[PDB]
């Protein structure tokens, strides 16, 4: 995807995120070296058809934390639009309070490095990337379905990647 290749360092980024406590903080993917990262890039905070897909991850953020994994959301929304949408109830198409950081990519540079930028317009597809503790991209999954991701499936994947890390000649049976 653009510059994202399985088994190679996940493209780096340094951008401003709206943290769960409300603060704007400029974070880098490298800050999470030492732990797993489930980086989920979605089109926009505002949704009309289904709830923004990132919400289900916020809701289950603790299960990811339990697995030494940090979930980070991202969309081409500016940090103000992010905040604005977090302060808009889910029933009005918004996000509601968030338990994970939301990265802002209004310049679309991150969407590009991850190859999830749409061809005609400036918004992304739904891209999920599982990155390991060493910063290596391990899973790439893209689609334009407002229900593509399954939080249980992703949790199972992280477990498989960790198991593999801790064994490797043995089938994650």
Catalytic residues: 50
CB burial readout 151-171, b (16+ within 10 A) else e: beebbebbeebbeeeeeeeee
Q: How far apart are the C-alpha atoms of 82 and 69, rounded to whole Å? A: 22
Residues facing residue 18 across a β-bridge: 24, 102
96 binds its own copies (CB under 8 A): no
CA torsion angle 11 40 65 148 (round to 10): -140
User: Is the separation of the CB atoms in 48 and 146 below 8 Å?
Assistant: no
15 or 154: CB nearest its own copies: 154
Residues facing residue 71 across a β-bridge: 38
53 or 77: CB nearest Cl ion: 53
**Contact pick of 92, 119, 121, 166 for its own copies (by CB under 8 A):** 119
41 binds its own copies (CB under 8 A): no
Residues 44-83 vs Cl ion: string with x where CB under 5 A? --------xx------------------------------
171 binds its own copies (CB under 8 A): yes
146 binds its own copies (CB under 8 A): yes
Instruction: Pick the stretch among 14-22, 25-33, 78-86, 153-161 that binds its own copies (CB under 8 A).
Output: 153-161
6 binds its own copies (CB under 8 A): yes
Other Cβ atoms closer than 10 A to 32: 17
14 binds its own copies (CB under 8 A): no
Residue 52 contact, options Cl ion, its own copies, none, Cβ 5-8 Å cut-off depending on partner type: Cl ion
Question: Which spans in 4-129 are helix H?
Answer: 55-59, 61-66, 79-86, 109-113
Q: How far apart are the C-alpha atoms of 107 and 50, rounded to whole Å? A: 26
**Contact pick of 56, 140, 151, 155 for its own copies (by CB under 8 A):** 140
Residues binding Cl ion (CB under 5 A): 42, 52-53
């Amino acid at each position: 995807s653009g510059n994202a290749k399985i088994g190679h360092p996940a493209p780096s980024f340094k951008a401003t995120a709206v943290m769960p406590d409300g603060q704007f903080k400029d974070i880098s993917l490298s800050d999470y070296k030492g732990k797993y990262v489930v980086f989920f890039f979605y089109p926009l905070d505002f949704t009309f058809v289904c709830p923004t897909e990132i919400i289900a991850f916020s809701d289950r953020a603790e299960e990811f934390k339990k697995l030494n994994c940090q979930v980070i959301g991202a969309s081409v929304d500016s940090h103000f639009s992010h905040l604005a949408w977090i302060n808009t109830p889910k029933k009005q198409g918004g996000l509601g309070p968030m338990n994970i950081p939301l990265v802002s990519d209004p310049k679309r540079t991150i969407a590009q490095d991850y190859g999830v930028l749409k061809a005609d317009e400036g918004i992304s597809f739904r891209g999920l990337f599982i990155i390991d503790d060493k910063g290596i991209l391990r899973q790439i999954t893209i689609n334009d379905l407002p229900v593509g991701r399954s939080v249980d499936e992703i949790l199972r994947l992280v477990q498989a990647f960790q198991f593999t890390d801790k064994h490797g000649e043995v089938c994650p049976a």
